[PDB]
Amino acid sequence: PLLTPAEVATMFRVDPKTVTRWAKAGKLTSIRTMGGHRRYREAEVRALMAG
Amino acid sequence: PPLLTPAEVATMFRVDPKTVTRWAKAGKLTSIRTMGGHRRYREAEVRALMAG
DNA sequence: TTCAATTCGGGTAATTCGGGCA
DNA sequence: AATGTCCGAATTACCCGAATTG
């Protein structure tokens, strides 16, 4: 399963650009759409509620 | 060779099937057409894009 | 043959990117 | 470092009816 940047934005209650920024700095593995959009592996996103 | 319907591609990218059709229509993706003109894409190449 | 599910097309909203600024 | 916001441009998502699928 994959999640959109908006969804990941909602779960932490943070702006989706900040999700984009957690993708920047390495602590979120991001798969990219061939238009260059982010899709985040939802397992890692569990690891972030584990943290 | 194994073939994928645009709904399955759509699923693996978490992306609306229309957008996969756009990707085909814009050269980014190799498309095969059935006798009616529906697209079918090539599995192998599609994870050649998970390689990228 | 019929039948549910999908995938055509086009059009139009809604996200997302990216960079730069606060 | 670490978010939040404004902008423009690009990408993607939902809407429809009709055609194709298997």
Numbering used by the authors:
A (entry chain B): 10 to 60
B (entry chain A): 9 to 60
The authors write:
Like BldD and BldO, BldC acts as a repressor to sustain vegetative growth, and so deletion of bldC causes the premature onset of sporulation. bldC encodes a 68-residue protein that is predicted to contain a winged helix-turn-helix (wHTH) motif, suggesting it may be involved in DNA binding. While BldC appears to contain a MerR-like wHTH, it is to date, the only known MerR-like protein that consists entirely of a wHTH with no obvious effector or oligomerization domain. Using a battery of structural, biochemical, and in vivo approaches, we show here that BldC functions as a pleotropic regulator of Streptomyces development by employing a unique mode of DNA binding for a transcription factor that involves asymmetric head-to-tail oligomerization on DNA direct repeats of varying number with concomitant distortion of the DNA.
Thus, to deduce the molecular mechanism underlying DNA binding and recognition by BldC, we determined the structure of S. coelicolor BldC bound to a 22 bp double-stranded DNA based on the optimized whiI binding site (whiI opt). The structure was solved by single wavelength anomalous diffraction (SAD) using data collected from a selenomethionine-substituted BldC(L43M-L58M)-whiI opt DNA crystal (WT BldC-whiI opt produced the same crystals) and refined to Rwork/Rfree values of 22.3%/26.8% to 3.28 Å resolution. Notably, the structure reveals that BldC forms a head to tail (head-tail) dimer on the DNA whereby each BldC protomer binds to a 9 bp direct repeat with the recognition helix of the HTH motif interacting in the major groove and the wing in the minor groove. Formation of the head-tail BldC dimer buries ~600 Å2 of protein surface from solvent. The oligomer interface is largely hydrophobic with residues Phe21, Val23, and Trp31 packing against the side chains of Leu11′, Ile 40′, Thr42′, Leu43′, and Gly44′ (where ′ indicates the other subunit of the DNA-stabilized dimer). Hydrogen bonds/electrostatic contacts between the side chains of Arg22 and Glu16′ help fasten the two subunits together. The head-tail binding of the two BldC protomers bends the whiI site by ~50°. However, the minor and major groove widths are significantly distorted: the wing-bound, AT-rich minor groove has an average width of 9.3 Å (compared to 12.0 Å for B-DNA) whereas the minor groove outside this region is widened significantly (14.5 Å). However, despite the low resolution, the electron density for the Arg30 side chain is clear and reveals that it provides highly specific, bidentate hydrogen bonds to Gua2′ and Gua11′. Thus, the analysis of the BldC-whiI opt structure indicates that there are two main DNA elements specifically recognized by BldC; an AT-rich region and a C-G, 4 base pairs downstream from the AT-rich region, which is recognized by Arg30.
